[PDB]
Amino acid sequence: DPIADMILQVLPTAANTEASSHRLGTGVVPALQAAETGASSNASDKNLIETRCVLNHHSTQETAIGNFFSRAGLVSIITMPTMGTQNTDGYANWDIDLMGYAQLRRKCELFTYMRFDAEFTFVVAKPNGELVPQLLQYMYVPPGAPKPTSRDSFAWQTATNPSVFVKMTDPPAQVSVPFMSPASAYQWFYDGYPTFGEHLQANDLDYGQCPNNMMGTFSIRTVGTKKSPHSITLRVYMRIKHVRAWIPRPLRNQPYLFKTNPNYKGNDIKCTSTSRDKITTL
Amino acid sequence: DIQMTQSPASLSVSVGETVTITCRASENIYSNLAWYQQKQGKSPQLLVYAATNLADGVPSRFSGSGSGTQYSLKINSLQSEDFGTYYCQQFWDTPFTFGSGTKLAIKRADAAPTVSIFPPSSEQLTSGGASVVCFLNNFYPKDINVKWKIDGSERQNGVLNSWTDQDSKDSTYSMSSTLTLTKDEYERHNSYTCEATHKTSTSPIVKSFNRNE
Amino acid sequence: GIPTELKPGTNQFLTTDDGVSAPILPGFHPTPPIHIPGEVRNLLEICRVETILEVNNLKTNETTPMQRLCFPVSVQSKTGELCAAFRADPGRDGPWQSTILGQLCRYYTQWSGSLEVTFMFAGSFMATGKMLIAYTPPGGSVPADRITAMLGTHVIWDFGLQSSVTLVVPWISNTHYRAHARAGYFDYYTTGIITIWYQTNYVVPIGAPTTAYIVALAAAQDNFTMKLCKDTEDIEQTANIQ
Amino acid sequence: SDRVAQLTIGNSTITTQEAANIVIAYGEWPEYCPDTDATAVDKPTRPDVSVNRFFTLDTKSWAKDSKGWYWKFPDVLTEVGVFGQNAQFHYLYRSGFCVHVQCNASKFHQGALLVAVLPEYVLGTIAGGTGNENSHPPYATTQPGQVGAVLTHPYVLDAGIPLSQLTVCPHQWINLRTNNCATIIVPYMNTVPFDSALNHCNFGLLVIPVVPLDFNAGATSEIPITVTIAPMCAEFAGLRQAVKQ
Amino acid sequence: EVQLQQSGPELVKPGASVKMSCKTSGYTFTENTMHWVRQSHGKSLEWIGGIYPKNDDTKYNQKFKGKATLTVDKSSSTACMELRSLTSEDSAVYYCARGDYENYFYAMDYWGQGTSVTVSSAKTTPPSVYPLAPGCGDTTGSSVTLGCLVKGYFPESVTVTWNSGSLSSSVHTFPALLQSGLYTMSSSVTVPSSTWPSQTVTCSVAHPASSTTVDKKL
Amino acid sequence: SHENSNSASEGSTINYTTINYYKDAYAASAGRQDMSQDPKRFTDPVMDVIHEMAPPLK
């Protein structure tokens, strides 16, 4: 050797409260803590006041991440009417970006990285709520697959694409979409300019856009060559299962404006706490 | 593409009779039909939308009706300002298609045409060509067949004619003739006859000319 | 062909029902995960973290929201004054909405367990004084005097080397769990009133500032539980999200 | 004995007199990339004495009307030292960071600073105040460099998140009554094993004056705030040409 | 109440491009769609495509997808189109009109003026008249008709004049005809036998485009 | 029916017993979640341990 320098605790129930008596002495001060160390206070209830033996049988299963995310939520509403300007040709291409509704978005913004599987549910209804015997076709378009330009296109042959033939008189179809992200987990917040070279003002749209969360398009159409006389409104519901979370973040107290970047209104900024008249009145 | 076929192509009737034109689509368009009225050199105007409701500035004489694929448009009573072509338009499939058109003329009595045959002059021979014209005026209806007989033989191609629109007071048409032939191939034959077979007489009139006449 | 009679519940889509759906990809093995620090397996680990409590929420400082994070304390001429008073219920609209304990409590209906309130003194080093932090059980209004407020749970804290102190709110309830309190038939689930008094005085020498600020922190304990999950009132979406 | 601390990383030494404990982010010490989680097949280089050392950034000025400052890591060190040149010559990067904030004052002053570490701190925009237009933050605000930028709204932190919930992040308070320093050890936290430092920022620093600075007339009116950042366990893979941006 | 004005007629060569405009007023331009309808010879109608002018929304035809583009300026109330790779069969009039509120259906009530666009590579040539007078020596019958012919005029059209506008009820017009890329004219006036050989008639054709007025004595 | 290991909970299982009537593992139910908690890395993220009876600052 010529060179020398080159050589989890399972808590199914809550914690019980043990009995304690009065204390009189110096040197021990469980009340006085230091908040400048970045740590929470480790003081308990028995070290300050007199407590009794309390057997705590309260369960902590509702506070788990899996039970908090196993409830379905509305993520997208696709309107395919007969009259209008947007999707009157008989087909509708919806890009897969689950940021359009603020009920399930605030749950996903609680954590930074989240690896999970999802369960999609597609409910078909008319704009007035009625139902007609109409045949509907779903299709999943991953990035790299051709997008259809009509209802009789070659992309609706669906050789390798997943497709669900459902009817409006049928129950809603449930599928299980797996973890399709190329990274280890989904990244809800991307910090930095992902492009290369010198960044200009016209290329400022690419901020906060990660390619790992872009799953492509979701295309629907009416099965047939002729146009259907009935308007079709589709609602997508995602159920999160087998969820692992990392790096918790503060929630948002501001109303959402855009789904691309978390912008907020500058003139009207609503406070988190409810205001009152005086600090000494109640 | 849903195509539309209108029948008939042209219908001539006098003022004071009911006019019924039909529009037919290949597929069901669910009563999504329009009607246009285009005059000579004017922009079309909407007459009745969705085959039951007329637009603004449209009188009560235009009444459309129909369901499914076959449709109809009834005009009662016909006036003197309702002449022009009519089209129908669908609102079901992209792209929107139009009909073939239905021209509405004014019906008159039988009229004899005026034979006009002129020999060519000598001023056009300097440029290296020759043209013999043959005109007919005051004829009804528009059904005519142009026949040129030279030494008992027809010439193809090079025979094409044009017509004029309907007049206000006279309400007749007019014919025109334009022939393209050089000067060296004109003096080889002598017989030149302009013939037109019309429904006025069973035998057409014969009128010819020669070189030195 | 086995005999089978269908039951009520046919063609029913429940959002909380855990079933088995058809997979769309055969043998799709996902990306192998890596070691990411900060894994959260339960929401009770987040509720035990101390977050800043906004005791100075008033209608005058809405334009300047930085003053809502601390309440002032100055030299008083007479002894025995009241500094601040607020309710100890994390499920009510007020000071507890700014904490992550109260925000996660608004996603649930019933809550249980004791919670802690930490007051940190950010004044000068030469500033000395004692403070009284009293906890009153429900059944009465805010006490006007200091002799009436000292009958409940209280502690005496002096300024020194440790610039912060904590006093836990004891779980004194008639029931095992309690819902969120509002004005009406739900006001019986109140936790209590937290009052902050002046014990002796606030003494500063010549050259020291006569006005200091106290930062309030709040967290939960090991016996804190919650149940009956729901949606919160703080989230709002009116027109759309473009 | 617990208030006196000394940090010796490389050829630099930081000695403090009054300070709190060292905060480890999420209880994870920074370590090298293991062979199980590594996806890059090339051999990376691991310099220790030339990279893993304390780098002093620019000096701020704490006034009575200060709003706050923020630094993007590792954007402050893309042009500083041998670590900045190795980040431009390599495509892959993975390192932990040692954040040390120094703010000293006299015993007659008062005030408190909140130093926090926010992974994936995405900056939003005020959208012109009305919210009907789509605006994005420019390159000078998203990547300010070693100088840093000033927060225009310290309550919402230009992201829509409140300042009161920021203590769920790995943080450490700087209160002038007790301590003058704060040390936060931040490991590598990302969904990828390696990532380019030029296009992506791993985490960011947030120093907000929650309690304002107040002092009588005649005392020192200039209070400096310095940040000394030290990389830990740096790995560089994918050797390429010189790439600035 | 709603007037739609288009651009002027422009004569272009094959291989180049053209750009028209459709300026309108009297209504909210951003809340009503527009369409473009062409009319080829003779009475056939086609549909170019629709445009919903909020930010950008265009429904292209499957035949005219790559040969027509629709752009809308939001500052001034106008609608401009552009065509590429023009040919001989693309010479037709173009219409523009307003559609329905937030809908491509409910067809247009008020239309445009119909600016004609022709595509030809022919050079502008001053016209040369052609005399035509009888004849073979024997006049038959009681009506001695005559006329004149115009050859070598471009573009459309020319004007007719008979004795400085003396008789206007017996002069008939005729459309142009295609002969080797050139156009021709004709006329037919019914004149009785009381003119020849007592009175002398003449035909004069003036061209407003090339500023050429040639008078010929018949 | 022998299922494969294609699931999001590979390496760290939070469920106890699920039901899978298909071949793939991600099509199964959620299952009863695990009761393991570790709040020491969130509440006390420091090097030297701070006792409850002992003062935090010497």
Q: Provide, as residue numbers in chain C, all residues whose Cβ is less than 8 Å from the Cβ of F35.
A: 42
DSSP single-letter state for residue D36: T
Evaluate whether C45 touches A247 at the Cβ level (below 8 Å): no
User: Mind listing the domains of chain D with CATH numbers?
Assistant: 5-239 (2.60.120.20)
> Which tokens in the block code for residue A195?
């492009």
The reply to whether B152 and B184 lie within a common domain is: yes
The reply to whether B147 and B191 lie within a common domain is: yes
| Minimal CA separation from A32 to chain F, in Å | 7
What CATH number is associated with residue B88? 2.60.40.10
The pairing of beta strand A165-167 with beta strand B208-209: unpaired
Is the CATH number of domain E128-217 2.60.40.10? yes
Number of domains chain F contains? 1
| Minimal CA separation from A109 to chain C, in Å | 13
Tokens 């990389």 label which residue? Answer: D231
Element containing residue A171 per DSSP (H, E): none
Collapse the DSSP code of E130 into the 3-class scheme (helix H, G, I; strand E, B; otherwise coil) and give the result: strand
> Which tokens in the block code for residue D204?
């960011």
Measured between CB atoms, does A147 come within 8 Å of chain F? no
Four-way CATH pick for E3-119: 2.60.40.10, 3.40.50.1370, 3.40.50.2000, 3.30.540.10:
2.60.40.10
Evaluate whether D30 touches D234 at the Cβ level (below 8 Å): no
User: Which candidate from C54, C122, C208 shows the least CB-CB separation from D111?
Assistant: C122
In chain A, the N- to C-terminal Cα span, in Å, equals 76
Element containing residue C146 per DSSP (H, E): helix C146-149
> Which tokens in the block code for residue D120?
């994936």
* Chain F contact partners (≥3 CB pairs within 8 A): A, C, D
Residue span of the structural domain in which B199 resides: 114-209
CA-to-CA separations, D218 to C75, C123, D64, D108, in angstroms, rounded: 22, 18, 15, 11
Choose among C148, C115, C126: nearest CA to C225.
C115
Residue span of the structural domain in which F52 resides: 1-58
- Within 10 Å of residue C61's Cβ, how many Cβ atoms? 14
Which residues between 76 and 105 in chain A have a beta carbon less than 8 angstroms from any beta carbon of chain C?
A: 99-103, 105
Three-state helix/strand/coil letters over A195-206: CCCCCCCCCHHH
**C116 backbone dihedrals φ, ψ, rounded to 5°:** -115, 145
> Which tokens in the block code for residue C53?
């409590």
Residue span of the structural domain in which A149 resides: 1-282
Three-state helix/strand/coil letters over C153-188: EEEEEECCCCCEEEEEECCCCCCCCECCCCCCCCHH
Method used to determine the 3D structure: cryo-EM
Determine the Cα–Cα distance for residues F3 and E205; give it in Å rounded to an integer.
Answer: 94
Q: Provide, as residue numbers in chain A, all residues whose Cβ is less than 8 Å from the Cβ of C48.
A: 40
The reply to whether B72 and B121 lie within a common domain is: no
Collapse the DSSP code of E205 into the 3-class scheme (helix H, G, I; strand E, B; otherwise coil) and give the result: strand
The reply to whether B75 and B149 lie within a common domain is: no
Choose among A10, D186, D205: nearest CA to F45.
D186
Which string of DSSP letters, residue by residue, matches B56-118? TT--TTEEEEE-SSBEEEEESS--SS--EEEEEEESSSSSP-B---EEEE-----BPPEEEE-
> Which tokens in the block code for residue E202?
């003449």
The reply to whether B160 and B204 lie within a common domain is: yes
Determine the Cα–Cα distance for residues E68 and E66; give it in Å rounded to an integer.
Answer: 6
Evaluate whether B60 touches B47 at the Cβ level (below 8 Å): no
Determine the Cα–Cα distance for residues A140 and A163; give it in Å rounded to an integer.
Answer: 7
Determine the Cα–Cα distance for residues A98 and A107; give it in Å rounded to an integer.
Answer: 12
Given an 8 Å threshold on Cβ–Cβ distance, is F48 in contact with D168? no
Resolution of the experimental model, in Å, one decimal:
2.9
Choose among A37, A200, A213, A219: nearest CA to A115.
A213
Given an 8 Å threshold on Cβ–Cβ distance, is D21 in contact with F40? no
Determine the Cα–Cα distance for residues F25 and A157; give it in Å rounded to an integer.
Answer: 28
Choose among D68, F57, D122: nearest CA to C69.
D68
Determine the Cα–Cα distance for residues C160 and C125; give it in Å rounded to an integer.
Answer: 8
**A105 backbone dihedrals φ, ψ, rounded to 5°:** -75, -35
CA-to-CA separations, C166 to B69, C200, C220, in angstroms, rounded: 83, 19, 12
Exposure pattern of D213-244 as b/e (b: 16+ CB <10 Å)? bbbeeeeeeebebebbbbbbbbbbbeeeeeee
Chains E and D make contact, 3+ CB pairs within 8 Å: no
> For B2, which residue in chain A has the nearest alpha carbon?
A226
DSSP single-letter state for residue F43: H
> Which tokens in the block code for residue A223?
């099965």
Q: Can you list the positions of beta strands (E) in C33-152?
A: 39-40, 51-53, 70-74, 82-87, 108-112, 115-121, 128-136
* Chain E contact partners (≥3 CB pairs within 8 A): A, B
Interface test with A, best of E31, E51, E105 (most A CBs within 10 A): E105
Number of domains chain B contains? 2
Looking at the DSSP bridge assignments, the partners of residue B18 are none
In chain B, the N- to C-terminal Cα span, in Å, equals 60
Which residues between 149 and 178 in chain D have a beta carbon less than 8 angstroms from any beta carbon of chain A?
A: 153, 155-156, 159-162, 164-166, 168-175, 178
Given an 8 Å threshold on Cβ–Cβ distance, is C41 in contact with F14? yes
The angle formed by the CA atoms of residues B87, B91 and B94, to the nearest 5 degrees, is 105
Domain with CATH 2.60.40.10 in chain E: 3-119, 128-217
- Cβ-Cβ contacts under 8 Å between B and E: the total is 102
> Which tokens in the block code for residue D23?
């905060």
The pairing of beta strand D110-119 with beta strand D203-214: antiparallel
DSSP single-letter state for residue B175: B
Measured between CB atoms, does A37 come within 8 Å of chain F? yes
The angle formed by the CA atoms of residues D41, D45 and D47, to the nearest 5 degrees, is 160
Residues in chain D: 245
Residues ≥6 apart with Cβ < 8 Å to C190: C87, C89, C138, C181
Q: Provide, as residue numbers in chain F, all residues whose Cβ is less than 8 Å from the Cβ of A242.
A: 7-9, 14-15, 26, 30
Q: Is B122 exposed, middle or buried (0-12, 13-18, 19+ CB in 10 A)?
A: exposed
CA-to-CA separations, D51 to D11, D71, D190, in angstroms, rounded: 10, 19, 21
Evaluate whether D101 touches D174 at the Cβ level (below 8 Å): yes
Which string of DSSP letters, residue by residue, matches B111-158? BPPEEEE----SSTTTTT-B---EEEES-BSS---EEEESSS----S-
Q: Is D109 exposed, middle or buried (0-12, 13-18, 19+ CB in 10 A)?
A: buried
Collapse the DSSP code of E43 into the 3-class scheme (helix H, G, I; strand E, B; otherwise coil) and give the result: coil
> Which tokens in the block code for residue E183?
């156009």
Evaluate whether D213 touches D109 at the Cβ level (below 8 Å): yes
Measured between CB atoms, does A85 come within 8 Å of chain E? yes
The reply to whether B120 and B171 lie within a common domain is: yes
Collapse the DSSP code of A4 into the 3-class scheme (helix H, G, I; strand E, B; otherwise coil) and give the result: coil
**D154 backbone dihedrals φ, ψ, rounded to 5°:** -75, -15
Q: Provide, as residue numbers in chain A, all residues whose Cβ is less than 8 Å from the Cβ of F9.
A: 242, 244
The pairing of beta strand E212-217 with beta strand A173-177: unpaired
**B60 backbone dihedrals φ, ψ, rounded to 5°:** -80, 0
> For D19, which residue in chain F has the nearest alpha carbon?
F57
Looking at the DSSP bridge assignments, the partners of residue E95 are E37
| Minimal CA separation from C23 to chain D, in Å | 25
Q: Provide, as residue numbers in chain C, all residues whose Cβ is less than 8 Å from the Cβ of D28.
A: 37-38
Evaluate whether D23 touches D30 at the Cβ level (below 8 Å): no
> For B181, which residue in chain E has the nearest alpha carbon?
E179
The reply to whether B70 and B144 lie within a common domain is: no
Collapse the DSSP code of E81 into the 3-class scheme (helix H, G, I; strand E, B; otherwise coil) and give the result: strand
> Which tokens in the block code for residue E39?
């009319």
Measured between CB atoms, does E89 come within 8 Å of chain A? no
DSSP single-letter state for residue F46: B
> Which tokens in the block code for residue B5?
């076929």
CA-to-CA separations, B118 to A166, B115, B193, E137, E191, in angstroms, rounded: 78, 10, 11, 12, 15
Measured between CB atoms, does F20 come within 8 Å of chain A? no
Q: Is F16 exposed, middle or buried (0-12, 13-18, 19+ CB in 10 A)?
A: exposed
Q: Provide, as residue numbers in chain B, all residues whose Cβ is less than 8 Å from the Cβ of E131.
A: 121, 123
| Minimal CA separation from B52 to chain E, in Å | 13
Determine the Cα–Cα distance for residues C103 and C178; give it in Å rounded to an integer.
Answer: 16
Determine the Cα–Cα distance for residues C162 and C210; give it in Å rounded to an integer.
Answer: 20
Residues ≥6 apart with Cβ < 8 Å to B29: B2, B69, B90, B91, B92, B93
> For A229, which residue in chain B has the nearest alpha carbon?
B30
Furthest C-alpha separation in chain F:
63
